Amino acid sequence: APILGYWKLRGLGEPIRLLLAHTGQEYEMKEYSFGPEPDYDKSEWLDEKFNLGLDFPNLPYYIDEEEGVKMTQTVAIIRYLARKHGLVGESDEETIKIEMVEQQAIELIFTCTRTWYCRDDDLFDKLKEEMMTILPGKLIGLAKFLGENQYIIGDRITYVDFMLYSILDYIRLFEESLFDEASSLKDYLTRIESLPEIEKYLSSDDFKRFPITGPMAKFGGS
């Protein structure tokens, strides 16, 4: 039965975990923990890193010996699973919209990570204020995109709803004020949370909202 490897944190793994949950697909979850203060070494990962026959050894990874699958890119992984459970577009019109939103989600992750991982206080704060001034536009764009739709593509839930859920949730837990002029999105997150297996997943003891990022990062650390 298939394996999903990633850190103890939510980070890039959550949206895959979310999709596995929704589709009720059985998986074993292999987690890696960091070292203690103030090292937090990745040695537990690095010991096994190059010895799993991964083309591009990285976290997360997904391994299905049973299906002869051994992958390592978060998007690649989620698109693979999306294909298997038909959580992809049924038309190129759909596909275009899905993939725009996909990339839109990733772009947020870039901006956020670039900031949450900067350690220089004088720099962290600088980027934080720069983020505050940029994201509102981003969130409005998504609000406009979604509009009266239930999910990103309308009525049907696609893998991008999982992607989007997490990055928006992370932003929510970071500065809700950014959602002040984009309420529609909060409703959307709730809509997702109300989903049966996502509600189970989120109400599990295994679920904790923190941490989002590594203990090394300023935000979402502990």
**58 marked ligand binding residue:** yes
Angle at alpha carbon of residue 124, lines to 122 and 130, rounded to 5°? 105
Cα–Cα dist 4/102, whole Å? 21
Instruction: Show the site string, 7-36: x = touches ligand GSH by CB under 6 A, - = not.
Output: x---x-------------------------
When CB distances are held under 5 to 8 angstroms depending on the partner's kind, the choice from ligand GSH, a second copy, none that residue 214 binds is ligand GSH
**116 marked ligand binding residue:** no
**151 marked ligand binding residue:** no
When CB distances are held under 5 to 8 angstroms depending on the partner's kind, the choice from ligand GSH, a second copy, none that residue 11 binds is ligand GSH
Shortest distance, CB of residue 200 to a second copy, whole angstroms? 29
Instruction: Using the minimum distance from each CB to ligand GSH, give the nearer residue, 100 or 149.
Output: 100
Cα–Cα dist 92/165, whole Å? 23
Cβ-based neighbours of 107, under 8 Å, separated by 6 or more: 138
When CB distances are held under 5 to 8 angstroms depending on the partner's kind, the choice from ligand GSH, a second copy, none that residue 80 binds is a second copy
Cα–Cα dist 24/58, whole Å? 25
214 binds ligand GSH (CB under 6 A): yes
Cα–Cα dist 81/118, whole Å? 33
Cα–Cα dist 71/58, whole Å? 9
**59 marked ligand binding residue:** yes
Residues within window 99-158 making contact with ligand GSH, judged by CB under 6 A: 113-114, 117
